[PDB]
Amino acid sequence: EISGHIVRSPMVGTFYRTPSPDAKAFIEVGQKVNVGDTLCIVEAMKMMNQIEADKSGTVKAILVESGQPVEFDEPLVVIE
Amino acid sequence: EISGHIVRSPMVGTFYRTPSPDAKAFIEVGQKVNVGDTLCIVEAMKMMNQIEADKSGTVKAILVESGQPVEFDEPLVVIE
Ligand SMILES: *C(=O)CCCC[C@@H]1SC[C@@H]2NC(=O)N[C@@H]21
Ligand SMILES: *C(=O)CCCC[C@@H]1SC[C@@H]2NC(=O)N[C@@H]21
């Protein structure tokens, strides 16, 4: 059912929506993003990987909640 | 940009995706739901309101994370 371009995790770690515990989220559903825009962060033992959009579009859905563990290739964000 | 049928909060309270702190979520993006299916819970001072689907379709997006406060009429879930 999930149609659109799916941005997947490039690593095993913990998913975060924000640049810090007190900051606002990089993106929200309905937001337009451009190639290169940071969508989220996946962290593993303090190694923090900033996941960027590989194509421009609108954020259709965010599939994981902040603080949740993600696997390699796990769907994170859908862009339409 | 958010196209589809939007299920909104009927009250001011706290949004929860699960029936208990240790349970799995009622729904996930991509899941097909039928009228009457529970999508989430909004809680205010232990008054727990189970939000049900008013139409059948596929969950396109979930707009709030568990434990976050929601306002009256705030968009919660999008059904396509
Ligand atoms: C390390 O274990 C200390 C906490 C690290 C927090 C980082 S900053 C970027 C991520 N966003 C967030 O909310 N927490 C993560
Ligand atoms: C009251 O303040 C005690 C905690 C109430 C927990 C309830 S059970 C249904 C909701 N889901 C969840 O994860 N927590 C909420």
Q: Could you give the CA distance from residue B63 to residue B6 in angstroms, rounded to a whole number? A: 10
Which method was used?
X-ray
Residues with CB under 6 Å of ligand 2 are B 16, 18-21, 41, 43, 46, 48
Does A49 lie at the interface with B, CB-CB under 8 angstroms? no
Residue B52 and residue B78 in contact, taking contact as beta carbons nearer than 8 Å: no
- Looking at the domain that runs over A1-80, which CATH code has it been given? 2.40.50.100
Residue from B24, B38, B41, B70 to probe ligand 2 pocket by mutation (most atoms less than 8 Å from CB): B41
Size of interface A-B (CB pairs under 8 A): 32
Q: Could you give the CA distance from residue A18 to residue A41 in angstroms, rounded to a whole number? A: 7
Nearest to B27 by CA among A1, A59, A3, A5: A1
Does A62 lie at the interface with B, CB-CB under 8 angstroms? yes
Nearest to A10 by CA among A79, A80, A70, A78: A70
Exposure string of A59-80, with b = 16+ CB inside 10 Å and e = fewer, is bbbbbbbbeeebeeebbbbbbe
Q: Could you give the CA distance from residue B6 to residue B60 in angstroms, rounded to a whole number? A: 10
Nearest to A57 by CA among A26, A28, A78: A78
Which residue in the block uniquely carries the two structure tokens 């909104």? B8
Tally of CB atoms within 10 A around A14: 16
Domain ranges of chain B: 1-80
Residue B19 and residue B51 in contact, taking contact as beta carbons nearer than 8 Å: no
Residue B51 and residue B42 in contact, taking contact as beta carbons nearer than 8 Å: yes
Instruction: Please give the resolution of this entry in Å, rounded to 1 decimal.
Output: 1.8
In this structure, what token pair is assigned to residue B19? 């029936």
In this structure, what token pair is assigned to residue A4? 């659109």
